[PDB]
Design an enzyme around this catalytic site. Structure first.
Site, PDB file in Angstrom:
ATOM      1  CG  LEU A 272      -2.255  -0.980   1.192  1.00  0.00           C
ATOM      2  CD1 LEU A 272      -3.205  -0.341   2.337  1.00  0.00           C
ATOM      3  CD2 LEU A 272      -2.812  -0.432  -0.065  1.00  0.00           C
TER       4      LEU A 272
ATOM      5  CE  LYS B 269      10.387  -0.804   1.779  1.00  0.00           C
ATOM      6  NZ  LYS B 269      11.799  -0.907   0.963  1.00  0.00           N
TER       7      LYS B 269
ATOM      8  CG  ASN C  86      12.621   7.072   5.574  1.00  0.00           C
ATOM      9  OD1 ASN C  86      12.027   7.857   6.166  1.00  0.00           O
ATOM     10  ND2 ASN C  86      13.230   7.259   4.527  1.00  0.00           N
TER      11      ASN C  86
ATOM     12  N   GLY D 244       9.447   2.060   7.812  1.00  0.00           N
ATOM     13  CA  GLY D 244       8.094   1.438   7.994  1.00  0.00           C
ATOM     14  C   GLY D 244       7.328   0.989   6.767  1.00  0.00           C
TER      15      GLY D 244
ATOM     16  CB  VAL E 114       1.111   0.802   4.693  1.00  0.00           C
ATOM     17  CG1 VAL E 114      -0.309   0.369   5.518  1.00  0.00           C
ATOM     18  CG2 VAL E 114       1.863   1.475   5.765  1.00  0.00           C
TER      19      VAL E 114
ATOM     20  CE  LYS F 178       4.996   1.972  11.280  1.00  0.00           C
ATOM     21  NZ  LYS F 178       4.849   3.422  12.005  1.00  0.00           N
TER      22      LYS F 178
ATOM     23  CG  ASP G 227       3.731  13.537   9.142  1.00  0.00           C
ATOM     24  OD1 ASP G 227       3.916  14.249   8.198  1.00  0.00           O
ATOM     25  OD2 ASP G 227       4.430  12.268   8.803  1.00  0.00           O
TER      26      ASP G 227
HETATM   27  C1  LIG Z   1      -1.398   0.857   9.253  1.00  0.00           C
HETATM   28  C2  LIG Z   1      -0.734   2.101   9.087  1.00  0.00           C
HETATM   29  C3  LIG Z   1      -1.223   3.038   9.794  1.00  0.00           C
HETATM   30  C4  LIG Z   1      -0.706   3.657  11.105  1.00  0.00           C
HETATM   31  C5  LIG Z   1      -1.195   4.812  11.774  1.00  0.00           C
HETATM   32  O1  LIG Z   1      -0.595   5.119  12.817  1.00  0.00           O
HETATM   33  C6  LIG Z   1      -2.132   5.425  11.197  1.00  0.00           C
HETATM   34  C7  LIG Z   1      -2.702   5.057   9.975  1.00  0.00           C
HETATM   35  C8  LIG Z   1      -2.121   3.921   9.436  1.00  0.00           C
HETATM   36  C9  LIG Z   1      -2.880   3.754   8.103  1.00  0.00           C
HETATM   37  C10 LIG Z   1      -2.184   4.002   6.842  1.00  0.00           C
HETATM   38  C11 LIG Z   1      -2.818   3.766   5.490  1.00  0.00           C
HETATM   39  C12 LIG Z   1      -4.173   3.144   5.500  1.00  0.00           C
HETATM   40  C13 LIG Z   1      -4.866   2.425   4.318  1.00  0.00           C
HETATM   41  C14 LIG Z   1      -4.730   2.701   3.056  1.00  0.00           C
HETATM   42  N1  LIG Z   1      -5.826   2.322   2.173  1.00  0.00           N
HETATM   43  C15 LIG Z   1      -5.074   2.592   0.949  1.00  0.00           C
HETATM   44  C16 LIG Z   1      -6.000   2.235  -0.650  1.00  0.00           C
HETATM   45  C17 LIG Z   1      -4.818   2.643  -1.499  1.00  0.00           C
HETATM   46  C18 LIG Z   1      -3.704   3.053  -1.418  1.00  0.00           C
HETATM   47  C19 LIG Z   1      -3.414   3.261  -0.197  1.00  0.00           C
HETATM   48  C20 LIG Z   1      -3.903   3.017   0.886  1.00  0.00           C
HETATM   49  N2  LIG Z   1      -3.952   3.159   2.405  1.00  0.00           N
HETATM   50  N3  LIG Z   1      -6.067   1.901   5.075  1.00  0.00           N
HETATM   51  N4  LIG Z   1      -5.983   2.207   6.452  1.00  0.00           N
HETATM   52  C21 LIG Z   1      -4.636   2.700   6.664  1.00  0.00           C
HETATM   53  C22 LIG Z   1      -4.428   3.006   8.101  1.00  0.00           C
END
Ligand SMILES: CCc1cc(O)ccc1-c1ccc2c(-c3nc4ccccc4[nH]3)n[nH]c2c1
EC number: 2.7.10.2
Length: 284
Positions: free
Chosen positions: A13, A15, A17, A19, A21, A40, A134
């Site tokens: 989803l 990337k 440095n 961490g 996802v 994450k 952030d």
């Molecule tokens: C788990 C990492 C995190 C850690 C925190 O402390 C706060 C938020 C997050 C987070 C970051 C991204 C997402 C996404 C998502 N859905 C997508 C569809 C398309 C492209 C990128 C996407 N990211 N869904 N839920 C997410 C939660």
């Protein structure tokens, strides 16, 4: 509590440095499908980053708000030393990408709906004395066409009981940082408000590449270091310009968020009222 074996990889989803996802299906009955989640993990598992990561989790854990992304749990199956954080998955991704691809269906009123929801989140964070640190268009997630949510809380810090700022690397989003964050490493609601000023700038430029804060500051910087140039540019009242077609009353809010002086910046409650009101004047 999430068990690795039931955590099936779907795709990457985003990337960074240290961490990353991933989109994942948590499938405890394996039968054949269950629920999709965002996961994450840390690449470079240095203990400061782990300790920071564990503190990120407690913050996430303590949050319940319609405009803040939902914590689901954590996976310890394979160690401390490779913890996984598990959050809800919002299909439309970040506001930065969403806005950029869907822009021709998104007018000033939509943009102001998003802005409102962002202020309600930051209000609610202010209540818990959290400084997000952030706030940028790339860390706002979209659940649907009428709802967005904050979060990438990996820089988020809790205020000391006795102070109203926090002193704190590594890569910092300098072009979203308030002057006292650059020079003295102080972070506050005040600095969060400065960041929101530039979020408001991002949305009203429609995330056009050539109009971006890095794009713009680096043109004004001309022509060491780069921070040192920024700090000085800001001290000489250098600022991101009015986006093309941006209303008077919106642009004023931006300008007010970017006041050199911490104490003269608007509060999130005030920013909610002002923006919620500008919408109605625009609609009705
Ligand atoms: C788990 C990492 C995190 C850690 C925190 O402390 C706060 C938020 C997050 C987070 C970051 C991204 C997402 C996404 C998502 N859905 C997508 C569809 C398309 C492209 C990128 C996407 N990211 N869904 N839920 C997410 C939660």
């Amino acid at each position: 509590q999430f068990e690795e074996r039931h955590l099936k990889f779907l795709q990457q989803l985003g990337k960074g440095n240290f961490g990353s996802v991933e989109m994942c299906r948590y499938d405890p009955l394996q039968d054949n499908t269950g629920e999709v989640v965002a996961v994450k993990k840390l690449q470079h598992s240095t203990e400061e980053h782990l300790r920071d990561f564990e503190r990120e989790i407690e913050i996430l854990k303590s949050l319940q708000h319609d405009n803040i992304v939902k914590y689901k749990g954590v996976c310890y199956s394979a160690g401390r030393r490779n913890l996984k954080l598990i959050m809800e998955y919002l299909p439309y991704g970040s506001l930065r990408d969403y806005l950029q691809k869907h822009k021709e269906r998104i007018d000033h009123i939509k943009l102001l709906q998003y802005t409102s929801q962002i202020c309600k989140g930051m209000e609610y964070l202010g209540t818990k004395r959290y400084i997000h640190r952030d706030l940028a268009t790339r860390n706002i997630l979209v659940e649907n066409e009428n709802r967005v949510k904050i979060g990438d809380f990996g820089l988020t810090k809790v205020l000391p009981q006795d102070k109203e700022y926090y002193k704190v690397p590594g890569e910092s989003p300098i072009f979203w940082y308030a002057p006292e964050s650059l020079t003295e490493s102080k972070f506050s609601v005040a600095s969060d408000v400065w960041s929101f000023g530039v979020v408001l700038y991002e949305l009203f430029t429609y995330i056009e590449k050539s109009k971006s804060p890095p794009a713009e500051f680096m043109r004004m910087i001309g022509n060491q270091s780069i921070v040192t140039h920024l700090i000085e540019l800001l001290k000489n009242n250098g600022r991101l310009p009015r986006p093309d077609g941006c209303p008077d009353e919106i642009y004023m809010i931006m300008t007010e968020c970017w006041n050199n002086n911490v104490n003269q910046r608007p509060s999130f409650r005030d920013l909610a009222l002002r923006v919620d009101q500008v919408r109605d004047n625009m609609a009705g």
